[PDB]
Design a protein around this ligand. Structure first.
Ligand SMILES: [Ca+2]
Ligand SMILES: [Ca+2]
Ligand SMILES: [Ca+2]
Ligand SMILES: [Ca+2]
Lengths: 398, 398
């Protein structure tokens, strides 16, 4: 007989989030130290992330079943709708932002209504891309460069960076890179001429790529092959999510200098402590860095695992404190729709929770967002040049 | 006994849209030539435009009452949710995009799901700001300038413009203007010095303001007073919505050259034909340019009027063709929620409609959007320098 039931809404592209979600629940149900006498059960629904009404409808159906919390892994398009639904129903909403096609994340810029209590906790850290890239270009004493971004990137994400470089009098070009690079560059040679080409080549000597790894790979290869860059060029690629396979391929395809900036996770070193966090045992497929799955995990997958860990500890604490409120079957858009009476106290318990997991430490600040993040800085073989985090800033000279 | 009932959802800031909506219905119900034996009735609801679940909920309640079409005047935050609801319920959705606080419009960038038929018709024309401003800077042979934007503007709206000026090798600075200008500029003098000040003054010799009129007025006054600009400066202000009072105040507060770019509406000249479109008589408060109300109308107000005119003609045609489908009471998020069976044919009738109204001609292209728009270009007293539209382009040399 289950009294612990959670709901999950996933974008159709988030099959790996669903896999890790289910594995996390499995791991916790094997853990005798957390929720000693209660199993966690769940209901999952996949939706078209670009259909906010579908998102709301299917979230509402989960709330009718009865849930303690709603986990979502979805993009910005439906995020606002789910956040506002959660606010109306007092269902704690653990929101894991997914980027589109591996493009670098930008804030959802949601301007969600602040009249009502906010039932959404943002599991992924704030987007710090603009801060990190400013620090790195400053260290390299750049004065003139071009920013290339892919067709999915939201340039509001660099608006602060653009303001700052302008204030400092720099010569910064923007350019969207079409999903089809060959046409873009082929068109370029046909239309331009020697004096113009030399100018473009000069512009390409310093660039920043704000794009998904696949497009960057293709983009680098095409300019290298067409000799638009040479051994003196220096490109910076920045994206929270670039895996080791991507890094090696980027280095392999590029000539000259490459700097790679990606998110990193501060997890224990010892083999023993790798698949353990205290007495919680993690399935080897997620924590062993020799496992093929673990190496192929998306960043959102790591946050989903830790989210389930955090929820389980919150439910445990609520039971231990003898302040349990039973789940309720809710209804959306009905004459007597009413919020979950247990919601406010559950939200507060979750909000002050903290766990050690696959991402490092997951916790929430007063603004309802995870504050913890670390970036590593690689440089061309390839080696680790430094680290960045929003607290201590840049460590290790570049 | 009414068989013609429409619904409207308005942002809390859209009281004038509601007023003009009601006046339009009144005007049509007085018109014996359109809907000769049927009165139009309606239900209006105001919502927090930043609360997409509230928007959906209240739209759903209107659909439960029974409506032939849904008119909305709202910002991008809830637009996606209402569009996807309309798609699910097959309710024709006449969407009038409102900008926040008079900031220049940018596309909602909605990436709304295209698997399903699109029941939304976009009443306002596409955002052409980026096209117009490119043409004007080219005519002035600008090579170096700064773009100032207000705190609400979505810079994705100029991403194409930024790409183009980069391609042409221009030196273009960006800067957000905080809602509080004095602090921004006061901070500036305290921190900077003669060599830096001369450089900033030089940067301010050519600027584009992408902001609401109120902030522009304040911004111009503060730089003029602090002598950061002089008689040789040349600023361009661009916004669909700048009324005559705003224009005069802008000119009055500015020194040097000012170019103002705003939307204009090609309506008849003759006094008689001003408050008439064929045999349809328009209330004098909306069409007489000597009336105080008409002079204070927002752009969205004009589109709301024409939208009601267009819907009435569509209903008329549907009746005349003997293809009427009665409204139905629909339910959202229920076990047997079903779309309106009359929706597909009503959508198609509306989509191919066209009326002469307060905006000029309102009609829809194959993409479901109004294609018609005209910009006028004013220049400093003040006079009309030229016109722009996406068909014939720029007319009258600047
Ligand atoms: Ca369902
Ligand atoms: Ca910040
Ligand atoms: Ca209501
Ligand atoms: Ca275009």
């Amino acid at each position: 007989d289950s009294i612990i039931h959670i709901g999950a809404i996933f974008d159709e592209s988030a099959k790996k989030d669903d896999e890790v979600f289910r594995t996390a629940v499995g791991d916790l149900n094997q853990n005798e130290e957390i929720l000693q006498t209660e199993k966690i059960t769940f209901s999952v629904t996949f939706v078209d992330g670009n259909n906010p009404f579908q998102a709301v409808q299917e979230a509402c159906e989960l709330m009718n079943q009865g849930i303690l919390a709603l986990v979502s892994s979805i993009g910005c398009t439906s995020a606002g709708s789910l956040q506002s639904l959660a606010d109306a129903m007092h269902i704690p909403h653990l929101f894991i932002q997914r980027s589109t096609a591996g493009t670098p994340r930008s804030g959802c810029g949601l301007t969600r209504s602040n009249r009502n209590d906010d039932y959404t906790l943002s599991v992924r850290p704030p987007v710090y891309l603009h801060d990190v890239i400013l620090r790195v270009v400053t260290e390299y004493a750049w004065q003139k460069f071009i920013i290339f971004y892919d067709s999915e990137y939201d340039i509001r994400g660099i608006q602060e960076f653009l303001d700052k470089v302008s204030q400092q009098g720099m010569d910064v070009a923007l350019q969207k890179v079409e999903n089809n690079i060959n046409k873009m560059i082929t068109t370029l040679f046909d239309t331009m001429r020697i004096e113009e080409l030399n100018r473009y080549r000069d512009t390409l000597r310093r660039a920043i790529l704000v794009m998904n790894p696949a497009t960057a790979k293709s983009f680098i290869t095409e300019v290298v092959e067409t000799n638009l860059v040479a051994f003196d060029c220096h490109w910076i690629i920045i994206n929270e999510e670039i895996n080791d396979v991507d890094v090696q391929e980027l280095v392999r395809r590029s000539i000259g200098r490459l700097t790679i900036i990606r998110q990193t996770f501060p997890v224990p070193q010892n083999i023993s402590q790798r698949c353990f966090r205290g007495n919680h045992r993690i399935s080897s497929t997620l924590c062993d860095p020799k496992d093929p799955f673990a190496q192929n995990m998306e960043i959102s997958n790591l946050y989903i695992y830790d989210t389930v860990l955090l929820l389980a500890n919150a439910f445990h604490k609520k039971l231990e404190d003898r302040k349990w409120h039973s789940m309720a079957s809710l209804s959306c858009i009905r004459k007597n729709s009413k919020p979950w009476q247990g919601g406010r106290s559950m939200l507060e318990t979750i909000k002050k929770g903290g766990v050690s997991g696959l991402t490092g430490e997951l916790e929430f600040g007063e603004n309802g967002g995870n504050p913890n993040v670390h970036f590593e800085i690689l440089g061309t073989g390839v080696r680790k040049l430094g680290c960045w985090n929003p607290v201590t800033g840049l460590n290790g000279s570049l």
